Design a protein around this ligand. Structure first.
Ligand SMILES: Cc1cc2nc3c(=O)[nH]c(=O)nc-3n(C[C@H](O)[C@H](O)[C@H](O)COP(=O)(O)OP(=O)(O)OC[C@H]3O[C@@H](n4cnc5c(N)ncnc54)[C@H](O)[C@@H]3O)c2cc1C
Ligand code: SF4
Ligand code: SF4
Ligand code: SF4
Ligand code: SF4
Ligand SMILES: [Fe+2]
Ligand SMILES: [Fe+2]
Ligand SMILES: [Fe+3]
Ligand SMILES: [Fe+3]
Ligand code: NI
Ligand code: NI
Lengths: 385, 280, 228, 385
């Protein structure tokens, strides 16, 4: 037939090349998505290096979803170490993650807005996202030190805990923000339907995965279920298998798409499935995040210590930290022996997706096909690291 | 109109603390605190501060420091008057002065006139202070305003006051106001018939209205209250400027008082037309 | 054919349910025995037709503009207005209410409909037992008032403590300690210490069934005819 | 446009006014449902009053779903107190709840029957519901003292326990009833499809909530997830926000519809969604209830004590009791301090629904729109209390 390669696909963090095989009508038959970004190699670089480092190096893996990465790393490490964050310390982490989901989602909207929103609106639409985006940052940076790339979160605690004056200053900002975010989603929700991408777009049979709506639970996860396999096996083509920079992580031997759409279906109950559905899911998802934001904020100890003291030298035993990044489930496993990491592995939400994305872009005329991919809002830098 | 009075003045207490935390004038706290010095009152019962946020629970404070904690305004029922039996009885007080809304105030005087099972209490109150109340609302009724209307926690408002033609919430870093016409449903069914905007019964009456912001207008209904006030002004705690001279005109306050009477009167006609019993 | 109308101002709605309880009668009864009109629950016509009798489930609320507005309309519409269930008749548990629970913190006052408008008969109970309600309907339908003499009398009743059979009867020296009134407690608040009734307020809804069911409170010699 | 107000909507307990905004075709655009009933104010009246009272006053909140309310209140209070019902005592409560679900559902059918059933049938149809209804009551009243408004259930136990002679008398009645109920649902199930309300009627994206198919589990509930917000925020209109008598309880900041349909999807597995679906769900739901009825009944101790003795003066700590009312999930939270309730809050199944009901009545011609609302079978007296 004829196969059309889009590289790199536009409007998503990093670079991925989508390769398509089409019939004469141009309906696609095999859709292949792979990430061609060079691997910055964090998982390796962290190894044999101290625990204290691991959160800092790791978050640079992805500057959009930095807070989830930092949280996961600390959780994985604290778990291997066995430190216990005090409840205020734990609450601060959750509060930051929520602010981050809200923000990250907004960033995604800015990126996909051009396809969705008419130009007349768009300058106004973009402005609102910035407005919602700007408030959310205040929380993420204020709680967690500067964010993006907040340096404040640390093994076994938070570096410091917000003053009541700070917490109050934050609250009004979050509570006041609630009306705009509610409206913003409706406009976004309103826009997405209008596009009327052909119904049945981007439907895949792949299982979804969620641990928690916001903060992720390590316990609801199976090392036994989980497996990771290199693209070399998974991909059809020697060229494509060699080109792809990303390992495919398999759940129960099944390619898995994990997302807000997935996070909603598992936890909220979101019967509808589509690409339009993934988009709808992203809005309501930030809607839910922001709530917890204010929820945790109102009830915050504000004097309870954040830091729990811990012993860095560690038992060989590995620990897993899973938290929900704006783009889907994330886990970090680390084993600390002698106080320096011995094995470090990260599966980022995109990584789970990239195998499912190619099958998704099949059927509907390919001009559509990048639309499906862009709906997943993958950030490669996360997928490859 | 106003209830018959000895004089009308708009005054502020001198002290920095009273100005700092007093809602308006700081006269109630200042007048009450001074009496303690003079000793006309052994202790007074002043609403607040309650277990909830911005919820007043009545407390009898012998201590001046305590009165200061009490000083502020909370727009909810605080049944001040429940205390009076308790305060006189245990923290035994020969003469006790209390701050009473006009509403509570109506309740005490008849009791002083008709004790009917209040023993010895009746003599004991020395100075009763009346605060003008247009309307006041249930804590929940209040709670909705602060949150559905102002989008703020109950924690954040440092002070809440009803400015003329508006409701004002003061929170660190902000002031938020909503119109009174917004407020109209919420205040208690009982107040619908509350005739007295000013505290006519009260010995001295203090209100924000008719005085510039930070200045409280105190009207002295009765001679004992007047005496305590004259003594305080001599003390120099309060800076007093005759009411008529300073805008807004006390005529405006008078108009507000009149409006209240018009509201009461028809409500009573409606209640009277209807079966359900009415006092008044 | 006779038109019965039931309007529920503010009621737990048990009273309506009790009405459906008399199953053997019920299926036929709406169809053959009686005609029901202007019941929002049981029918969907918004403005009431004239009705031979009106059954009002719940105590009116002074604050709510509609309930008061509706009640005034009801008197013209219903040739006979009967308030049933304690909540219309005595104000029942409603009395305990102190308003101020959101939303609508203001609504704090509820009064038995009877106080607002003269009511021909009220039969109380929370709910009224299904049988009594059926017996009256047949009685009303069959037009006999020797039977409904007690109820016409009961319309007056309004406020009723558990406390009251003690004032109303035991104090009068009427009480003989039969135990009938304790049995007639839906709440189960009443119980008999030797041998008089002792009731515990924490658990009384002021339905009024105990004052009504004491043999002492009012003796119909109507019943003697019924057995024999 | 033109907005049509139906008040009060017919055939549902209490009064709610539905307000509709329609295009020229009359397809609705915004559907607003609010409850205009005056608040009897139970949540407040209970406060500062004894624990012993709380179940009695509370159940009067709703005389249809009285048993769920009583159960919830006792559970909330016993939990705050910490009494432990002995297993027979616990079993009696479950047995009563099951009888109640069966009965309550039947009552709902009687109410909505006129739209569904032809007049020729209807006198027969109504009779059957009464027949099923009459047997179920025997169990609810016999176990729990007179019901409706059973006074028998009490803090930390049941007032008394049924004699074997009673239990036997009951069983035959329940077991014999099983054939009729099975048939009754089929006729109801058969009728509902015939109406053929336009497919896609009453579909909403709102998350469903269930704790348990019959008896509700407190543990599967999040105070953290839960929030309640006053209509004043939620409603579009100042007039409508002021008019509405009901707080909206938000799950994860999302309006939630909780129902038999919801109870089935969460627990049974009920993939289909519709208004027709809610109706179908109500039948099979009683079908399941009645089973447990007989199940618990066969294995009943009958001599094991019901009452567990408990200390009324309580720790400040609040406790939540959640049980499934015929119309959807219910919880009661109470804190008992000094032996008198200090904070009491009830969320009734309708309360959860009322926000979701307005969005549901959008799209299909409005003459349909009350049909959607009536499917939820809301009882306002519950929603407002
Ligand atoms: C419910 C209410 C409504 C009011 N409405 C008006 C109004 O419409 N216009 C107006 O000019 N002034 C009104 N006031 C009074 C006014 O707002 C100032 O509070 C006061 O009159 C000025 O005294 P101050 O400046 O010395 O303040 P402060 O020194 O703070 O004196 C305030 C005193 O009021 C007492 N108090 C607080 N809350 C209550 C309560 N619920 N019941 C009884 N006592 C209480 C406290 O004990 C405190 O000591 C109202 C007060 C209340 C309580
Ligand atoms: S308006 Fe009248 S009844 Fe209401 S608080 Fe003020 S004085 Fe009392
Ligand atoms: S009389 Fe009883 S059953 Fe009827 S509405 Fe009133 S409380 Fe409910
Ligand atoms: S019915 Fe009357 S006399 Fe008989 S026991 Fe009860 S209260 Fe006493
Ligand atoms: S004691 Fe029982 S019957 Fe009498 S009024 Fe109270 S609840 Fe009703
Ligand atoms: Fe990896
Ligand atoms: Fe509630
Ligand atoms: Fe990521
Ligand atoms: Fe219910
Ligand atoms: Ni990322
Ligand atoms: Ni109910």
């Amino acid at each position: 037939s004829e196969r059309i390669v889009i590289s790199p696909t536009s409007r998503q963090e990093g670079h991925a090349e989508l390769v398509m095989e089409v019939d004469d009508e141009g309906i696609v038959t095999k859709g292949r998505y792979f990430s061609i970004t060079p691997v910055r190699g964090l998982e390796k670089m962290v190894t044999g290096k101290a625990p204290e480092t691991a959160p800092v190096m790791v978050q640079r893996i992805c500057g959009v979803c930095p807070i989830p990465h930092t949280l996961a790393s600390v959780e994985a490490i604290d778990d291997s170490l066995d430190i216990e964050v005090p409840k205020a310390g734990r609450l601060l982490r959750e509060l930051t993650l929520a602010a981050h989901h809200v923000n990250s989602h907004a960033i995604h909207h800015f990126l996909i807005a051009p396809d969705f929103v008419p130009e007349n609106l768009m300058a106004d639409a973009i402005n609102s996202v910035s407005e919602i985006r700007k408030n959310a940052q205040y929380v993420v940076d204020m709680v967690a030190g500067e964010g993006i790339h907040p340096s404040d979160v640390r093994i076994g605690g938070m570096a410091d805990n917000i003053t009541e004056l700070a917490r109050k200053r934050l609250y009004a900002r979050l509570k006041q923000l609630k009306p705009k975010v509610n409206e913003h989603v409706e406009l976004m929700i309103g826009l997405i339907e209008d596009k009327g991408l052909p119904e049945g777009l981007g439907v895949h049979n792949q299982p979804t995965l969620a641990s928690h709506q916001i903060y992720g639970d390590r316990t609801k996860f199976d090392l036994d279920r989980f497996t990771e396999i290199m693209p070399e096996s998974w991909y059809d083509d020697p060229e494509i298998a060699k080109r792809a920079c990303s390992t495919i992580p398999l759940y129960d031997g099944r390619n898995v798409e994990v997302g807000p759409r997935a996070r909603m279906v598992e936890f909220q109950g979101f019967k509808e499935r589509g690409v339009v559905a993934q988009h709808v899911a992203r809005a309501l998802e930030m809607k839910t995040a922001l709530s917890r934001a204010i929820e945790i904020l109102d009830e915050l100890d504000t004097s309870a210590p954040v830091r729990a003291d811990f012993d860095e030298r560690g038992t060989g035993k590995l620990g897993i930290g899973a938290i929900e990044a704006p783009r889907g489930l994330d886990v970090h496993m680390a084993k600390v022996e002698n106080g320096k990491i011995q094995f470090y592995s990260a599966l980022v939400p995109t990584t789970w997706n990239i195998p499912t994305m190619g099958p998704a872009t099949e059927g509907f005329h390919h001009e559509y096909g990048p639309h499906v991919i862009r709906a997943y809002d993958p950030c490669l830098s996360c997928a490859t690291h | 109109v106003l209830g018959t009075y000895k004089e009308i003045v708009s005054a502020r207490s001198t002290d920095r603390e009273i100005q700092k935390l007093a809602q308006d004038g700081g006269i109630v706290t200042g007048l009450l605190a001074y009496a303690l010095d003079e000793g006309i009152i052994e202790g007074a019962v002043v609403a607040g501060p309650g277990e909830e946020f911005w919820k007043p629970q009545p407390m009898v404070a012998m201590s001046s420091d305590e009165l200061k904690a009490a000083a502020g305004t909370k727009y909810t029922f605080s049944p001040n008057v429940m205390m009076l039996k308790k305060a006189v009885r245990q923290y035994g007080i020969e003469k006790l002065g209390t701050v009473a809304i006009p509403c509570q105030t109506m309740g005490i005087r008849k009791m002083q006139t008709y004790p009917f099972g209040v023993r010895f209490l009746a003599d004991k109150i020395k100075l009763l202070v009346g605060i003008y109340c247009m309307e006041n609302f249930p804590y929940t009724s209040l709670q909705t305003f602060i949150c559905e209307k102002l989008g703020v926690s109950m924690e954040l408002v440092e002070k809440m006051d009803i400015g003329k033609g508006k409701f004002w919430v003061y929170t660190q870093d902000d002031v938020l106001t909503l119109p009174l016409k917004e407020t109209h449903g919420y205040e208690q069914a009982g107040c619908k018939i509350c005739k007295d905007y000013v505290a006519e019964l009260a010995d001295v009456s203090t209100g924000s209205v008719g005085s510039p912001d930070g200045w409280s207008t105190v009207i002295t209904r009765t001679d004992a209250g007047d005496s305590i006030f004259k003594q305080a002004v001599e003390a120099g705690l309060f800076e007093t400027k005759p009411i008529e001279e300073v805008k807004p005109g006390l005529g405006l306050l008078e108009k507000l008082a009149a409006q209240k009477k018009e509201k009461a009167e028809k409500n009573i006609a409606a209640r009277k037309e209807m079966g359900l019993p009415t006092p008044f | 054919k006779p038109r019965i109308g039931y309007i529920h101002l503010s009621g737990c709605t048990g009273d309506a349910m009790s009405l459906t309880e008399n199953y053997d009668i019920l299926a036929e009864l709406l169809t053959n025995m009686v005609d029901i009109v202007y019941g929002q629950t049981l029918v969907d016509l918004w403005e009431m037709p004239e009705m031979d009798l009106a059954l009002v489930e719940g105590s009116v609320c002074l604050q709510d503009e509609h309930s008061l507005h509706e009640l005034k309309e009801l008197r013209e519409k219903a040739k006979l207005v009967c308030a049933f269930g304690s909540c219309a008749a005595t104000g029942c548990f409603t009395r305990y209410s102190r308003g101020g629970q959101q939303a609508q913190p203001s609504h704090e006052s509820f009064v038995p409909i009877a106080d607002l408008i003269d009511v021909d008969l009220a039969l109380p109970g929370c709910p009224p037992s299904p049988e009594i309600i059926a017996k009256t309907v047949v009685a009303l339908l069959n037009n006999d008032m020797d039977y409904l003499q007690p109820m016409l009398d009961l319309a007056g009743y309004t406020e009723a403590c558990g406390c009251d059979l003690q004032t109303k009867v035991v104090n009068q020296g009427l009480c003989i300690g039969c135990g009938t009134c304790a049995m007639a407690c839906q709440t189960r608040a009443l119980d008999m210490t030797n041998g008089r009734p002792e009731l515990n307020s924490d658990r009384c809804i002021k339905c009024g069934i105990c004052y009504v069911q004491c043999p002492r409170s009012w003796w119909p010699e109507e019943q003697i005819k019924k057995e024999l």
